[PDB]
């Protein structure tokens, strides 16, 4: 009902934070030449359509992606608002939206749903990723409170604490995107509740530069490409 606890703390935000603390794990890592996003997906359903095109990971425009921990129903309302804002910026300025302007845009909407008592807050945590000329490769996180922070590597959702410790000891400022592929897969295999990692339990993506000077490219990996980085990395659930 958006009233303070006597400590000056918001009960609804704390309960929304309890909800996302169950909501599946996501890791993001910022290499010297690209960003990696990975998310672990609890497929307890055989008849759920794996090889559906998205669940945890989404495009916001041609150079920005997100991972979702939380309610996917809540996330998709924010994701569409961010997509509309990215194209409305591109229409106005003829230029691609800077990552800080969009990440904090979704952090200002999520704060409003925490102040007015007719609205429940959004049960979603986002690990944003992208490139722009103002900064370069940027990795941000945002949570049900409307707080947002810049990171070199971060986890959200379940098992955050184990994942942050594993990131901290292996992360290097000068590492390449293929080292961040390896690291994010290792971290998730060293954090997972499921017995071993496999291509349908895993959502993956990258924000590389490629060979051509003007390019930045956002491969949100199809299952067969994820099977290749799995067998190359030594996670290798292979015949």
């Amino acid at each position: 009902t958006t009233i303070f606890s006597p400590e000056g703390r918001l009960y609804q935000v704390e309960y929304a934070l309890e909800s996302i603390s169950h909501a599946g794990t996501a890791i993001g890592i910022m290499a010297s030449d690209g960003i990696v996003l990975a998310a672990e997906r609890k497929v307890t359903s055989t008849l759920l359509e794996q090889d559906t095109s998205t669940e945890k990971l989404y495009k916001l425009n041609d150079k920005i992606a997100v991972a979702v921990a939380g309610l996917t129903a809540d996330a998709e309302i924010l994701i569409n608002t961010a997509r509309i804002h990215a194209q409305n910026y591109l229409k106005t300025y003829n230029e691609d939206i800077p990552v800080e302007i969009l990440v904090r845009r979704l952090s200002d909407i999520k704060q409003g749903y925490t102040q007015h008592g007719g609205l429940r807050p959004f049960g979603v945590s986002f690990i944003y990723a992208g490139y722009d000329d103002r900064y370069g490769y940027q990795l941000y996180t945002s949570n049900p409170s409307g707080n947002y922070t810049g990171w070199k590597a971060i986890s959200v959702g379940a098992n955050t604490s184990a994942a942050q410790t594993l990131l901290q000891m292996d992360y290097k400022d000068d590492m390449k995107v293929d080292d961040a592929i390896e690291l994010a897969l290792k971290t998730l295999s060293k954090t997972t509740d499921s017995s071993a990692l496999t291509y349908d339990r895993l959502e993956f993506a990258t924000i590389r530069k490629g060979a051509n000077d003007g390019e930045v490219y956002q491969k949100i990996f199809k299952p067969q490409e994820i099977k290749d980085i799995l067998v190359k990395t030594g996670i290798t659930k292979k015949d």
């Binding site: 307890t44 055989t46 604490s161 184990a162 942050q164 410790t165 594993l166 901290q168 000891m169 295999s189 060293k190 509740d193 499921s194 017995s195 071993a196 496999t198 339990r201 659930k237």
Partner: protein, 1425 residues
């Protein structure tokens, strides 16, 4: 028989040693059992209601109760003198050669036959003795048992079930068991118990000089729970500490006083309250420590932790001196302790406590236990010098009066409500304690007078009036509960309480409070509490039938809460009053012309402002107005039935529907035959001529349970009621009811058919022998009902007809619950209160109940119905087994006959017998009434016993023939598997007792409901004939449900259990969840059944993992998580080995949520149980009191010591083997991820940290090498497991390889020395030693306490000289293996990984500090480089 107890002359000398050598006459034994001067004397008070003499069959002989107890005591002795107080080793009857059971270890249930098996578990045989305590045994055998359960409750070294052992001593020393104070009888027998074993165990909760050797610490929840449990045992045993040891009080105080400091306050104060006895010698008295308690208490603010122990102390000392002054024993025990104005309290102490008492009710709320708080004040009052005490109580009540008032809610409300209730309850407990001394002796003049009960009403009447109007209804109930205690004192002031409750009750029923729902509800609550006292007084009794008809006419279909409070009043009126016309053919009498005039005059007098003591009327007018009051009952019942038919359509709660059935039946049992005949002809006319079954889901029970209660009272009504019902059933089937299919709902076209069928089911369950008349007709109607209706929801109802028909014929139960019997018993018509407060309430001529005991004609009908309806259903399904169809009809037909075959097994359930499979001793203490006889000899010499068993078997064989049919043709079809599983559940469970249909609402009055209505605190059996009747019914019912059904299989149970195990493993949730519940129940029924279940589930998981049978694997892991299977895994070392490797293979199945369930099971297997190696620190008095005279039992306890020892070692060789096979898997598999790798670490850590387990350097190397995984949590687990393995090696040196020193007080390690602080200059030696940094003479790590208040005890201290280890070779090699791997590089990357995990938490860990302290030992010992 292992025990030797088959010998007649050993039984004879055992019986005589246990003093169970009773005289063979019932009459002479029942005489000398209550004679203080007799060899066999178990009770000082004779029971007023001998509840087992009112049964219609021969309960077991005192000779056979003696025989049963003697068997229990030799087996309880063998269990304790064999030293296995944890019970887990599970010695087999096979281990007798070298010269299978579940439940009892925690949360036990009793297998009450003394059969050929001997189990040697202390937890099993104490549960048998808890059941034996239902009968009697001499106080000299009670002395022995109180001695045993004292020392057996103080055992150390293993994980005993201490809580039921403490509660066993508490039952043996009871202050009230049928008004007998067994502590004072045991004190007269000369029971003496050792305070030093208790005091020492409580002193293990004091701070120990080395942090590493402190055996118990508060804040840890298990040790806090253990402390609270031993404190309870210290309180219960305190009265048996020896009077003649004159120094005991002063020496125990001298020890505890000197131990008192801020660190020890929370231990020492409860130890002082609990252990120190109240002895009163010429020189030393417990009252000398009042100045000391007032010194602690007077110097601190009100705090719950300090205040609860000192109210308990001074309260129980006050109660003891008061009790000793009233008893004759004060000339021995309290001479020179005079009772004063305030008891033992001086004026300043009582002035202080009254100030401290209001200090909590008005300012700080610091009370926890109110019954302890009020006890100094209740036992302060001198009944001959009272005026200065009552002057403090009027001024206490005046201080708190404003904090009671209903608009003043806050923190003080719960304090005040509970203080008022506890003071009034406790004062009434004092009054009724000393009234009982007065009744058989003399009055001391410290005893309270009438003037004191008057003064108490004058103080508390306004308080109870204000507090009963509270906004919280549980707070209001505390004050409303006080009125009954104030009326039970019989004060001269009692008119003040009755006048108030009449005024408010007339003002509610006249709608004067219509805006104020708390006045409506609280006045109904107040009136309900006092009906039983208003009924006895000749003036206020004129009001009750006027109130009864006003309550009945006010019953409501909208307000379910008002209806509940009206029904409380109506049943409370009904339970105490005879619903009878008392008019003497006085043709002048009328309610309108005598009663209602006088009621208006009394009410008008009372409401003017006058007391009822001013109201004058002739006894002639009063008796005419009372007699006239009884003529109004038939019009009240007309409105009652009319309201009951309106409640059939209301959306009621099950609790209120049940309460409405209870009031309707209590009314019927209170009627004379005149009023009841009118009500019975009124309950059947309205039933046929109703407009009252309209809604989707009617309350059929509200009319059909009343019709069945008519038929319970009068068998003659059944013929026309049943005949008319079955005519109305046949008509509804002809109109097409039940001919349109639906599933999970009764259609609205079927509601009248459901009414007549449920009315038929209920009426049949009460027909008893009236069924013989129309039995043929009912059987031919039952066939017709199975032929003509096929809707699945109606099959459950139509099949329950046979249950109810069969059940009546073979059930033993009370027919008569009447308030007054027969229309023909001797009590005069002056009986308006139900004899509740008379001596003749207990009279055998008042309590001549009448029972349905089954006839030979009714059993012959029962067997005839059973075999006819079962043959019918077998033959009908077998004709559908030819040519199956997938049609919806085909399934619903199969379900019907299978359902019918489940309700022929119910009801006839009382004819089956668990022991039939043994035939082709056994002392059953509970003699549930059987028909074929209690002996094997009787049972098999009746051909109806064999005929009944033949049918059970033939229905069971049909359920297997059906399971193969359904699994081959219809393996998807869930509802007929659910019906089959319910058929199998009933077939496995209901042998000789009824377990389904046991707890659902029925046409007997509820014993808990009538006990809640008629029970009154500190009053003995304040009950009427209805309540005595249903208590005698409850007794026989208990014996039937306490009769043990555990048995060994006959091949048919195994075939059917294997089908239950298959269905429990099935892939459909709707089959497996029922089947797993059935499996739990069928395991309870069979011995060794867990072995048969795990023998099937382990191979099946192995086959499923091989086959990639995802779905089945997760179902199997849900079977392993069944509490009964899961708990048995922990104590099953032979199959846990193969289970663990199979769960490790399951931990790499990536599908569904498998691996996550196997991880949960493996996480729980880390709480597996180890066996202490000869770690049993016990007194010989834990078993020597029960040692029989004979030479043979010594040799048998020596045999069990040896055999069990081998089993313990065999379980310790399986865990060592499993450790080695997991470490093998840990080193061999370089790629095993982390969750599984961390399962080998925790499991090996638990085996390597236990003191019984031998050290192993490969464990240490393998666990240390997991640093190389770089996983944070594996590194945390490695430092913790290294530390735990080395703290064991260190302690193996300090205990000097004698593991038992770990569990002995009076052993202190060689680095601990004992200082005598009594020495003549020690107080200054300590302050100059505590200043000494240069050359310390000793040290005190942890916390000091000795010398804060005073010196004088032994202080434990740590010496200056360093801890050099005196280890042996194997221990030296493991520490050198750690020290060799404790490299600079290992330390560097351990510490770096602790730094990086702590980056967000920023905590300080004592586990890391003790790791550097361990490294320093390896450095200083030269093991580390």
């Amino acid at each position: 028989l292992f025990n030797g107890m088959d010998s007649t002359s050993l039984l004879n000398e055992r019986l005589q040693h246990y003093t169970l050598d009773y005289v063979s006459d019932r009459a002479q034994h029942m005489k000398n059992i209550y004679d203080p001067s007799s060899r066999w004397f178990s009770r000082s008070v004779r029971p007023e209601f001998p509840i087992e003499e009112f049964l219609p069959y021969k309960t077991e002989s005192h000779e056979d109760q003696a025989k049963y107890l003697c068997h229990v005591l030799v087996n309880l002795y063998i269990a304790i003198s064999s030293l296995d107080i944890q019970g887990l080793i599970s010695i087999s009857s096979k281990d007798l050669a070298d010269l299978d059971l579940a439940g009892p270890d925690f949360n036990a249930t009793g297998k009450i036959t003394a059969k050929s098996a001997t189990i040697v578990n202390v937890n099993h045989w104490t549960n048998e003795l808890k059941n034996c305590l239902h009968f009697d045994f001499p106080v000299a055998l009670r002395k022995s048992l109180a001695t045993v359960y004292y020392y057996l409750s103080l055992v150390q070294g293993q994980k005993v079930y201490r809580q039921m052992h403490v509660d066993m001593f508490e039952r043996l020393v009871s202050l009230d068991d049928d008004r007998t104070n067994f502590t004072e009888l045991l004190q007269k027998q000369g029971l003496l118990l050792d305070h030093q074993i208790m005091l020492n165990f409580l002193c293990e909760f004091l701070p120990y000089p080395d942090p590493d050797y402190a055996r118990y610490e508060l804040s840890s929840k298990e040790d806090l729970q253990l402390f609270r449990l031993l404190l309870k045992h210290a309180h219960n045993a305190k009265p048996f500490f020896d009077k003649s040891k004159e120094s005991l009080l002063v020496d125990t105080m001298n020890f505890l006083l000197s131990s008192l400091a801020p660190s020890t306050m929370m231990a020492v104060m409860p130890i002082v309250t609990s252990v120190v006895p109240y002895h009163y010698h010429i020189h030393s008295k417990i009252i000398d420590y009042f100045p000391f308690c007032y010194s602690i208490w007077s110097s601190v603010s009100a705090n719950v932790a300090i205040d609860t122990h000192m109210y308990d102390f001074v309260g129980s000392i006050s109660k003891d001196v008061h009790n000793k002054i009233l008893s004759s024993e004060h000339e021995k025990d309290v001479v020179g302790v005079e009772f004063g104005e305030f008891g033992i309290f001086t004026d300043d102490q009582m002035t202080f406590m009254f100030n401290r008492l209001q200090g909590h009710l008005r300012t700080d709320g610091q009370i926890h236990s109110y019954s302890r708080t009020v006890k100094p004040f209740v036992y302060a009052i001198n009944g001959s010098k009272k005026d200065r005490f009552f002057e403090k109580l009027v001024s206490l009540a005046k201080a708190i009066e404003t904090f009671i008032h209903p608009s003043n809610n806050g923190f003080w409300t719960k304090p005040n409500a509970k203080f008022v209730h506890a003071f009034i309850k406790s004062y009434h407990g004092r009054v009724k304690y000393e009234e009982d001394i007065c009744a058989r002796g003399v009055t001391n003049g410290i005893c309270l007078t009438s003037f004191c009960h008057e003064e108490i009403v004058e103080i508390f009447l306004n308080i109870i009036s204000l507090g009963s109007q509270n906004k919280n209804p549980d707070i209001a109930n505390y004050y409303i509960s006080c009125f009954a205690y104030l009326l039970e004192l019989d004060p001269s002031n009692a008119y003040l309480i009755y006048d108030k409750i009449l005024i408010d009750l007339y003002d509610t029923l006249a709608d004067q409070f219509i805006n104020s729902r708390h006045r409506i509800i609280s006045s109904l609550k107040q009136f309900t509490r006092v009906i039983r006292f208003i009924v006895m007084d000749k003036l206020y009794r004129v009001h009750i039938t006027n109130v009864l008809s006003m309550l009945v006419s006010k019953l409501d279909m909208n307000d379910t809460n008002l209806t509940s409070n009206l029904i409380n009043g109506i049943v409370s009126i009904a339970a105490f009053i005879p619903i009878q016309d008392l008019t003497g053919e006085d043709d002048y009498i009328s309610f309108e012309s005598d009663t209602l005039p006088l009621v208006q005059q009394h009410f008008y007098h009372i409401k003017c402002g006058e007391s009822s003591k001013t109201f004058r009327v002739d006894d002639e007018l009063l008796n005419n107005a009372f007699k006239a009051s009884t003529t109004v009952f038939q019009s009240m019942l007309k409105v009652y039935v009319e309201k009951i038919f309106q409640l059939v359509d209301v959306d009621l709660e099950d609790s209120l529907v049940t309460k409405i059935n209870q009031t309707t039946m209590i009314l019927q049992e209170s009627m004379d035959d005149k009023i009841f005949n009118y009500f019975a002809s009124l309950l059947q006319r309205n039933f046929w001529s109703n407009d009252s079954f309209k809604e989707k889901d009617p309350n059929y029970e509200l009319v059909t349970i009343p019709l069945a209660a008519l038929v319970r009272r009068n068998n003659g009504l059944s013929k026309e009621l049943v005949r008319t019902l079955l005519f109305h059933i046949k008509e509804q089937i002809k109109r097409g009811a039940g001919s349109v299919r639906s599933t999970s709902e009764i259609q609205q076209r079927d509601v009248k058919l459901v009414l007549y069928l449920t009315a038929l089911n209920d009426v049949l369950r009460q027909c008893h022998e009236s069924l013989l008349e129309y039995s043929d007709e009912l059987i031919t109607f039952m066939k017709y009902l199975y032929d003509n209706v096929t809707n699945p929801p109606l099959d459950v109802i139509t099949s329950i007809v046979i249950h109810s028909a069969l059940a009546t014929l073979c059930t033993t139960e009370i027919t008569d619950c009447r308030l007054f019997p027969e229309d023909s018993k001797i009590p005069e018509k002056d009986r308006w209160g139900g004899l509740q407060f008379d001596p003749r309430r207990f009279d055998k001529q008042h309590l001549s109940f009448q029972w349905h005991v089954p006839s030979s004609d009714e059993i012959t009908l029962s067997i005839s119905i059973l075999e006819s309806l079962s043959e019918y259903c077998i033959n009908n399904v077998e004709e559908l087994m030819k040519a199956p169809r997938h049609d919806s009809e085909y399934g619903d037909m199969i379900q019907k006959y299978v359902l019918v075959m489940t309700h022929t097994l119910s009801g006839s359930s009382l004819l089956f017998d668990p022991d039939f499979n043994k035939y082709r001793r056994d002392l059953d203490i509970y003699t549930c009434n059987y028909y074929f006889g209690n002996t094997t000899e009787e049972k098999l010499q009746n051909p109806q016993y064999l005929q009944v068993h033949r049918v059970r078997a033939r229905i069971g064989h049909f359920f297997h023939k059906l399971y193969v049919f359904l699994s081959t043709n219809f393996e998807n079809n869930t509802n007929m598997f659910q019906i089959l599983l319910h058929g199998l559940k009933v077939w496995f469970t209901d042998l000789g007792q009824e377990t389904v249909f046991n707890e659902d609402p029925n046409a007997f009055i509820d014993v808990d409901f009538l006990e809640n209505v008629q029970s009154l605190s500190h009053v003995n059996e304040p009950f009427t004939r209805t309540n005595f009747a249903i208590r005698a019914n409850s007794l026989h019912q208990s014996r039937v449900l306490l009769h043990s059904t555990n048995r060994k299989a006959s091949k048919l149970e195994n075939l059917l259990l294997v089908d239950i195990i298959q269905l429990a493993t099935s892939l459909y949730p709707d089959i497996y969840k029922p089947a797993q519940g059935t499996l739990v129940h069928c395991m309870k029924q069979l011995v060794g059944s867990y072995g048969v279940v795990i023998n099937k589930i382990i191979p099946s998981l192995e086959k499923a993992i091989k086959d990639h049978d995802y779905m089945k694997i997760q179902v199997i892991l849900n079977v392993l998580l069944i509490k009964k299977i899961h708990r048995k895994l922990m104590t099953d070392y032979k199959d846990i080995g193969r289970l663990i490797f199979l769960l490790i293979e399951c931990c790499r199945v990536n599908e569904l949520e498998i691996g996550m369930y196997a991880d949960k099971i493996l996480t729980d297997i880390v709480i597996g149980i180890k066996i202490p190696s000869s770690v049993c620190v016990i007194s010989d008095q834990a078993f020597l009191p029960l040692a029989p005279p004979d030479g043979t039992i010594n040799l048998q306890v020596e045999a069990v010591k040896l055999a069990k020892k081998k089993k313990r070692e065999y379980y310790l060789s399986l865990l060592v083997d499993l450790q080695d096979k997991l470490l093998d898997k840990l080193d061999n598999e370089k790629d095993m991820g982390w969750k599984i790798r961390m399962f080998i670490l925790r499991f090996v850590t638990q085996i390597q940290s236990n003191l019984e387990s031998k050290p192993d350097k490969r464990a240490v190397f393998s666990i240390i090498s997991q640093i190389s995984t770089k996983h944070p949590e594996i590194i945390h687990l490695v430092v913790k497991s290294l530390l735990s393995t080395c703290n064991k090696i260190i302690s193996l040196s300090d205990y000097e390889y004698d593991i038992t020193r770990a569990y002995k007080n009076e052993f202190n390690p060689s680095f601990v020395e004992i200082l005598d602080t009594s020495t003549t200059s020690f107080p200054k030696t300590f302050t100059e030693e505590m200043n000494n940094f240069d050359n310390p003479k000793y040290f005190i790590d942890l916390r000091a306490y000795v010398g804060w208040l005073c010196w004088g005890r032994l202080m434990y201290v740590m010496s200056p000289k360093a801890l050099k280890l005196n280890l042996r070779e194997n221990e030296l090699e493991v520490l050198k293996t750690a020290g060799h791997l404790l490299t600079r590089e290992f330390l560097r990357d351990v510490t770096m990984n602790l730094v990086q995990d702590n980056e967000t938490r920023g905590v300080f860990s004592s586990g890391n500090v003790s790791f550097f302290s361990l490294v320093i030992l390896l450095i200083s010992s030269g093991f580390c480089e």
